Amino acid sequence: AILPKPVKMSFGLLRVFSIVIPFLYVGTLISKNFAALLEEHDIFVPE
Amino acid sequence: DRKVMEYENRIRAYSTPDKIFRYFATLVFMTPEDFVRSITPSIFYTLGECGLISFSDYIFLTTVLSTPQRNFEIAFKMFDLNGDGEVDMEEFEQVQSIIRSSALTTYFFGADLKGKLTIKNFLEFQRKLQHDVLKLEFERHDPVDGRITERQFGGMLLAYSGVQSKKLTAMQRQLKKHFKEGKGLTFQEVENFFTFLKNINDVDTALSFYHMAGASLDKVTMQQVARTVAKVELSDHVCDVVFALFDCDGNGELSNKEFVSIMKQRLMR
Secondary structure (H helix, E strand, O other), rough: OOOOOOOOOHHHHHHHHHHHHHHHHHHHHHHHHHHHHHOOOOOOOOO | OOHHHHHHHHHHHHHHHHHHHHOOOOOOEEEEEHHHHHOOOOOHHOOOOOOOOOOOOHHHHHHHHHOOOHHHEEEEEEEEOOOOOOOOHHHHHHHHHHOOHHHHHHHHHOOOOOOOHHHHHHHHHHHHHHHHHHHHHHHHHHOOOOOOOHHOOOOOOOHHHHOOOOOHHHHHHHHHHHOOOOEEHHHHHHHHHHHHHHOHHHHHHHHHHHOOOOOOOOOHHHHHHHHHOOOOOOHHHHHHHHHHOOOOOOOOEOOOHHHHHHHHHHOOO
């Protein structure tokens, strides 16, 4: 016999994209914020 | 061998001067060259060998290196017990036993143990000693015909400030790229500017007058106060170097906590 249907989920591509993109924006935001936060003190290292 | 370098920096910047004495002495006594190695990360032939017996000549010559002029005159006031205006080496021995609790004493007071010392000789002593130290610091960096580079002068300023800043270190190594040409810094510019930096507590008066209103420091005000309290002339190239080195936020003009508060705190300790 043959197995049943491989089950999918409720619009997986859309919810994966809709959770990966705003948290990517939150990541780049807090990266800029941390860069400024220790650019204020002398802990940074760009040269 | 950068570890011994930075370890000697950590010793010389913060430790008690007796540990600095026992660290930079070989004989327990120092030569004047031992003293120069203690103070750096011809009066040598006048200082002799009988010097820094119990690390108290160290404290005294440190005081000579670190005393503004009115403070220098009131130090001469607190030397003189009877207040005759003269301090022989005998009165200095009487003060010096209290300090602790001789070649320079024979040299500058009297060879026959007879000191008849005016204010002017004491002033000459300060000027010769500090000017020889400043000339040694100007010539350690090998000036290009009496003209040091911008990073050399910035390193001298950061060595005088004594604060381990890495923001200002990055600004120092950027200075050659900021001022893409550098004509050099003459010894008279260095002389006048460290003469100005010697007296910042006196300079702090009109600065705080200006400052508790507002922290907006331009160069014409600094040159007026420099020519006022020290009669020195700050060339505008030196002002360009100071503004390019210390203005961290880059707003054009300095605050207290950018430059003056740090230099004052160095003058405290």
